[PDB]
Each structure stands twice: as structure tokens, then as C-alpha cells.
Amino acid sequence: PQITLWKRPLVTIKIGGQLKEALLDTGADDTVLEEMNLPGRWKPKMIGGIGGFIKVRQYDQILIEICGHKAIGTVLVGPTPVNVIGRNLLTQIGCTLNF
Amino acid sequence: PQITLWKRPLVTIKIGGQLKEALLDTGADDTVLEEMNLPGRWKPKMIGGIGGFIKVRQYDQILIEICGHKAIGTVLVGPTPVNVIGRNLLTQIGCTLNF
Numbered sequence A, B: 001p002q003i004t005l006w007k008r009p010l011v012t013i014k015i016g017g018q019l020k021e022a023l024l025d026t027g028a029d030d031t032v033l034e035e036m037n038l039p040g041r042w043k044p045k046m047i048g049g050i051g052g053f054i055k056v057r058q059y060d061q062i063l064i065e066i067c068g069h070k071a072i073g074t075v076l077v078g079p080t081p082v083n084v085i086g087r088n089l090l091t092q093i094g095c096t097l098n099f
């Protein structure tokens, strides 16, 4: 679809069989979701931005369906302020900015 | 223009005749610029990043030119590592997300 930006670009995602709401975030290199259980092994990672860094659990090659489009990639899980879909997955669903 | 997300969506902006590089960031409600000594009145503000909050100065009615489109609105100035153009200005230039 084409999504305008008068509202936060929040969309429903499906990950680990669970539905969640996440923000399409072109300013995020990476996808970061709030704490949750996901199957498979994870590695501890640090991710940083404004304010500094947080500790996250890195899950690789995770299926995630974003507004009906499938992606398989890295998902970071931790105490993020907001569920954000970053460019690592936005590229997979073919998302571009246009004006 | 169409901007893919293989790399950070950095564009040149003009603010006060000064040219800067900034992210087109659908994840930011408002525009956040690196420290710059703008004249005029401002009001204090706190914004929450992935690593916690920082203090910024809110300037209103600031003109920013983005790829031939002029936008005017709120700009937050503070110790951010990156210039980000937020939805408050992206909407004015007709920017959408598309997939």
C-alpha cells in the first residue's frame, strides 16, 4: 500500500504466531521489538541510539509478516520504547520512500 | 524522488542557508537536529530515544527546504548523533511509504 505520515505508521505484524503492532521506522537500521519469547537460539547484543544503548536478544532468520508481506531476518528483542520495523526488514518487503 | 532503504535515507536539507545531511525518518514524530545556535525563543522539551531521554530545545515555525520542497514547522535541537526529518515535515512535502 501507500502510507501517508499524518499518523504514526503503525501496522500489525505477525511473529512467532503472535500478532503485534509495530512502527515502520526508516530511521532505524535494525528491527527492535519489546521483550517477548521467540523459539530458537539468540545471542546477546547491544544496540544504541539517542540516549545510549540497551541490551537486546538477537534472533536471526525469524519469519515476520508485516501488513501481509513476509520477511525473514534479524529481530532484536529488548526494552525498546516502541516496536520498530527497521530497514533490514523494510527492504525485504520492498518498502521505499517517495515524494 | 524514490528513496530505497538499502542504506540510510540521507538527504541534503537547507536550514538558514546552511546545508546539512538528515535522515528522512518515519519513526520520528518531530524533526530533531544536531546542536546549532538558532536565534529566537524556544521552549525546553524531552524526547525518548532507544537508550533513554535527552533534553532538546523546541523551535517553532522553522523553514527547512528538502529536495526543492519547502516545509515549515517545529524543529528540536539537541545532542543527537544524527539529523532526522520527522513526520511533521515529511507530510508537508508529500512523502509516503510504499510497498
Ligand SMILES: CCC(CC)CN(C[C@@H](O)[C@H](Cc1ccccc1)NC(=O)O[C@H]1CO[C@H]2OCC[C@H]21)S(=O)(=O)c1ccc([C@@H](O)CO)cc1
Pocket (backbone or CB within 6 Å): A023, A025, A026, A027, A028, A029, A030, A031, A032, A047, A048, A049, A050, A081, A082, A084, A086, B025, B027, B028, B029, B030, B031, B032, B047, B048, B049, B050, B081, B082, B084, B086
Ligand atoms: C527506536 C527509536 C524510535 C522510537 C519510535 C525514536 N527515534 C527515531 C528512530 O528512527 C531513530 C533515529 C536515529 C537516532 C540516533 C542514531 C541513528 C538513527 N533510530 C533508532 O534509534 O534506530 C535504532 C535501532 O536501529 C539502529 O539504527 C539506527 C540506530 C539504531 S529517535 O531519534 O530517538 C526520536 C524519539 C522521539 C521523537 C519525538 O519527535 C517523538 O517521536 C523524534 C525522534
